[PDB]
Point group: D2
Chain length 471, copies 4
């Protein structure tokens, strides 16, 4: 029943002891917006030192209770929380859309990964085991993974609910308590998560939320009772050879640039296209790009909502202005989009941008824009691309499009990108294993590695026989 | 054939490109000693920036070759190096003793763990596997662990050859190159390892050694081509209840305090002893402590060699002086030990020390001495000890002596110590799993976790079908 | 709302294509009972060859659909079935009690393990991964675990619902279809499971149920389209004189009289050290005489009836032979007549405690499958380990002592696959860590049972050229 | 220094208590040959019941010592045996060649896998760990893998030293003892392994060797002290017209003519797409006719003789029946007489390539176990899949096409457990990732073979008090 241009936060945005609270202390005052309308949905207080201390002391007490619960008990509560998220999916997706501006289409996908994450770690909480080892004469050594205590999770504005689920689910599955600090741009959706954990049966204090910016974050990092803080060259390339399947390359290109309004570092923004198919690819992309439905994020047919805020939209438009000054040819977009609905008129919209005649020395090719901007760079040979494209960090992604798999695997072996795609490109958070595919699963390793980030190995040795003295 | 009071370094102490070299640049000049005699075994140059750059550039080139070798090929060379260490064990142990001062007894034990470590990781190099996952429509995702590049290992003086093996074996098993910086106190034994890797068949540059202190270490940390650097409340308690087996507790106590001349952080120095058995335990400990054979570390019967250096010896003798000022009762030792052999006259020896009438406010109970000093503190009940002993950090060890296992497991559950011992106490480096027991093995987790420290997960997705466009 | 002495099966007991069906052919006719009343709850037909063929052909078709579903999709449906079991727990526990006779207390515990099992394997279905390996020149090898096809589950009467969930959850999590054959003694509770899987969203045919005995079982084993069939001295308890008396007595009673002592794993041979023999024997008889025998649907009942009249007759026969052989019956070992007249024809007997037992006595040698405790006196640690170690690996053992060196020494010496120190849990063989409550399954158990219901498929991709030896 | 036409066994062929022995009992008398010459290298006695009993009793005693050794100690001994195999590689490869007939080229490859296998399991022996689990109130459960006891290895003639290593290395790494029964065709090379284990430091009895056939094998299976016995449409190759010709031809020859095509693994049914039939058939015949047939000890030999005269006669019989049934012999299928007169009575034949092959022909239906390639023409992807999906899981398949969508589609459709894309490796079933050179074993293969040679022991420690239901 919740629609665009109506929502106003009517409750406090901090969460401690199983209840929404006003911060005890201030480190600022921020405004959260509905990017679709440009309306202020909340004027909230940034948490000070005393408030951060209260949230950590509260989490410490909940940790002491929760860490004493068995794996199977923590699993039951996390599986209930996953069922509550699934039942309230649309309500959560709606609230995510209002504050962030992504399409209800993409918000539902984030909520799915959110409850999937919770079930995965709940499963791991229930099945965890340490090692048992035999020592001579009946003596034995055994290991167990223990939680750390109070963990802090830092939020980002591009995947608010998802980052919050993805940080808290493993931390909590381990036996830890979490103090979460959302991005001051997106304070709202993390409270839905806090409320849902409480409903599922987590002890009061286990998942706390303190709102704030840099000063709040610093108070959390510096807090002596905080065990751990979980934070959030060239840019991600997309290579399109002339032997590729045109339609799939065009579809991949648009998916790699214009999903989440292109406000992701995952995005395959540098689109290296082979000289022979340049013209055909460029024309088909512009054609498919001009068809992208820009509008109200709550509408089922919207595939492009607004940019997070007004300063962010101005920055993206600034990059387009500098691009054409530097010699780029704007094919479509890169300008303010005006919707027909007068309730969306002060909303932060723009037309998706496709740039041709791009060079490696251009700032639009060098810098990550965080907007719907595609840079098309022409290339001649496999050797040339790999030279221009291998200045990419491991933390980034890459995609290759070719029908010949020998070429594909050769290019994937050469590129320094941690996540590679062959004849596809998925835009998904870094933390997601197997490039964030739908019917993929998490595998086993990802959870093992993230479980050990939120825990410590305790070792016990039992001497059965007598002590062998060196003296 | 190598004996005490004769060895002098006659070759350069840096190692690059499969050969011993003089540093190209200086950041100081250090003296390495034979602690048994107080003789200077080497006057060496500390590596400067240009020298660190040469060693890293050389490691970079070796990395490029080695990382391209298969797991099975890296395994063959690491198993051959383990065979060479095992064949040259006594020569290595002797050279370790001359520079460090530990007994040939303890040096052999370190060399054993060293070649055991190399076999373990060689086995893991050969059997490594990533994950394969099925995606809908014949599509698939897969992972692989790749090396980082040039890894740096920082050495310590207490386990010179052991720390160099333990850091390099996993790093190299992964496909990395290592630049190793030994402690300026112990430069010599790491060159034996460098030489052995070369003999085994590692490419020139794969295991480099640069000598130096803090400035050398800083140059290594700051080097832009260095992928990763591997570094190194109350103190480790030992609880002795009155229901324990006396002889085993006394043996454990002496092992926990006087092995490696008590120059280890993991040593169980705070010895909480229950009021009823205090007198009998104290007397038996002093009796067994006064029997400890102090002398030339090359002698098979020596169980106590000299302290690393004269400044270190002076510091320990200073702690004993402050302890008796604060109210401690010295039972035995804590003074200069003079050997009968005139070649050991200027060596850094002291008698193992046993202190009674100790309190929790005394600096000898609060501070880590790094010498053979045992603090005996009387206690009344299980509740009292656990209060006085739970100011211990996770990174530390603990030991409990009692015949009742319910008490033992209760105390082990309550203590914050990462490594716990029941009716025993092993003094072993932190990195060692299952408290560094002899016929223990490393299990599976330890290697998995250490591999993951020296590598990164590369993910590849292959789209078999068509791209599903949201637009 | 379901109570004792009222239930009658009013629907067919076979299940195929998402519906209860009458078998297409016969291999017999069995009677299922309510052991608390002795009433016939069902007269059912044992499945013949044609019926077994129909159930397998149906499972084959469902397998083809289900095996094509992703891990995550199979997980969703198995987690829903676990939620349905949990919501209907009391209804399932009640129906289990009526047909089997165990206490509502113990039935709830079995149902808990049943939905816990489903969640575990659902989790593993979602997170399964094969291995990826690099070969020279960009070439690579990879593995995947594939289902087998039509798997058969064979049921037992002592844990009807538990066995059905325990065999079907992993088989189904793998991508297989199952044809389940319950024990002809307990046909009823497996249909609740069949119905629940259907409700959860399994395709019709994925979990079929054919009723029958040995002939039905043989038809299933011999069926050419069946990929795999998953089938269904004695366990000692050593009580040293340095043990904690109350804990040993509690452990003894738990190890003998739970599930009416009808489990094979039960610690029936109770070796007790000579010094505490008398005190231990007296305290045990005292606690045993206090065991609440009655209607299993009652919350305070800890002992219901024995499964059958021929089964009850057999246990009573062992007691008769025991006292003939020289045993001294302290309490029980005779027909129990409850207060409630609706329980008058129920298969009830008082729990038995036997003293003055010897190793040559048939009650100490043979497995009774009733509430019978044999107390054997012993002198030393060396003696027990001689008399007691003639136990096979598939059995359990328990040791009671305050000294852990003795405990671990005894546990190291005994050939028993599952050992207990200062406790004794009575739980199915298949349950890891001796079937403890807040234990979990660990990781290995599931990996091993996943392996039983699947096969490793290997694929090698050559990137470069073929290296010819010729 | 060892050459063809000279070797004679001069010692007994049984091995017990760290020494070569004559069997105490007889179940037959077999002759072992040098297939390259037709010479008798040994006339040996097949072990009877009493001899099998002695070897098992001896293994039982060694088991008791070895099982008590730590993982690290068993690892040391197995790493020393791998080093001894590696140092004596050529001597072992030579002795393997003399008795079996494979090329020194292929024998070295088998010896490599043999010492690689030993190192792998030695590594696993050193790093083994069970599970540790927390239970409420400080209580805990733990697991450990224990050896079984006396394990029996059954040998095959096609990979003598390899099978002996592959069965013994894991069995021994677990803490077991092994009684090994080689194929009566190849008794010799397993004694080199027995002798090498002894030299490495295994206790006398740990690796015993009893020679014999079926009656010996039956005595081993029936022996009450034996814990476990480890025993030993056809594999298609699909060549589409969009494949790389040279790689397909190379793959075809590798898949048919390695190990004289005497493996069950071999991709003998060669389905070739109608457009490339003629070009492929002619290129195959060309490369087949240039395969170097001769003395297996020569470095350039790629084809030796067949294991024995009866096997050679069987293969020649298949060729005779093939041309009767309508096949067109392009090359081979007949007695080969080498240039060397010492190879005169050797079991040689020229490698065979058959065209005009139909599905109803016995050469396409039956496994030949000789160098015989059947070329069957096909029209479409749908046709091959129907004609080729009659292949069991235990078999292999290979597909040659430049389009990977087709390749993965065909690999998904085929029931073969091991599939190859644009390659075909001929390697023993037990080998993971299709037996590639710089592959490694991965982790799962060893975990699964460890489980086969061991049993899980579970121990529960109650820290608190016993929770009584009564
Ligand atoms: Na609100
Ligand atoms: Na609310
Ligand atoms: Na961000
Ligand atoms: Na020197
Ligand atoms: Na080792
Ligand atoms: Na050092
Ligand atoms: Na030298
Ligand atoms: Na070097």
């Amino acid at each position: 029943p919740m629609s665009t241009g109506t929502f106003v936060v009517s409750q406090p945005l901090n969460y401690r002891g199983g209840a929404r609270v006003e911060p005890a202390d201030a480190s600022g005052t921020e405004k959260a917006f509905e990017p679709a309308t440009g309306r202020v949905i909340a004027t909230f207080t940034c948490s000070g030192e005393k408030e951060v201390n209260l949230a950590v002391q509260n989490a410490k007490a909940a940790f002491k209770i929760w860490s004493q619960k068995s794996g199977m008990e923590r699993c039951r509560i996390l599986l209930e929380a996953a069922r509550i998220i699934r039942e309230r999916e649309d309500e959560i997706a709606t609230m995510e859309c209002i504050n962030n501006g992504k399409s209800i289409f993409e918000a539902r996908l984030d909520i799915d990964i959110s409850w999937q994450c919770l079930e995965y770690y709940a499963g791991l909480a229930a099945s965890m085991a340490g090692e048992h080892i035999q020592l001579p004469g009946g003596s034995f050594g055994y290991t167990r993974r223990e939680p750390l205590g109070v963990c802090v999770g830092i939020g980002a504005w591009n995947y608010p609910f998802q980052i919050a689920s993805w940080k808290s689910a493993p931390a909590l599955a381990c036996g830890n308590a979490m103090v979460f600090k959302p991005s001051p741009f997106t304070p709202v959706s993390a409270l839905l998560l806090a409320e849902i954990y409480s409903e599922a049966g987590v002890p009061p204090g286990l998942f706390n939320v303190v709102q704030g910016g840099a000063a709040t974050g610093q108070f959390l990092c510096q807090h002596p009772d905080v065990a751990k803080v979980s934070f959030t060259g060239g840019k991600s390339p997309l290579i399109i050879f002339s032997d590729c399947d045109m339609n799939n390359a065009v579809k991949g290109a648009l998916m790699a640039n214009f999903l989440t309004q292109g406000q992701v570092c995952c995005n395959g923004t540098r689109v290296f296209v082979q000289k022979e198919i340049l013209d055909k690819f460029t024309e088909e992309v512009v054609k498919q790009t001009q068809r992208i439905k820009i509008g109200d994020p709550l509408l089922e047919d919207t595939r492009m909502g607004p940019l997070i805020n007004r300063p962010h939209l101005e920055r993206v438009l600034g990059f387009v202005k500098v691009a054409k000054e530097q010699g780029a040819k704007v094919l479509c977009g890169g300008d303010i989009y005006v919707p027909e609905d007068p309730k969306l008129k002060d909303g932060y919209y723009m037309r998706p941008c496709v740039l041709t005649n791009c060079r490696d020395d251009m700032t639009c090719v060098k810098e990550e824009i965080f907007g719907p901007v595609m840079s098309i760079l022409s290339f001649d040979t496999e050797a040339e691309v790999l030279e221009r494209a291998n200045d990419t960090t491991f933390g980034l992604a890459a995609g290759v499009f070719t029908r010949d798999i020998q070429r594909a695997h050769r290019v994937v072996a050469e590129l320094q990108a941690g996540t590679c795609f062959i004849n596809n490109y998925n835009v998904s958070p870094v933390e997601l294993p197997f490039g964030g595919y739908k019917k993929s699963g998490f595998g086993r390793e990802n959870g093992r590695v993230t479980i050990e980030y939120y825990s410590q190995l305790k070792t016990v040795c039992v001497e059965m026989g007598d002590v062998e003295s060196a003296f």
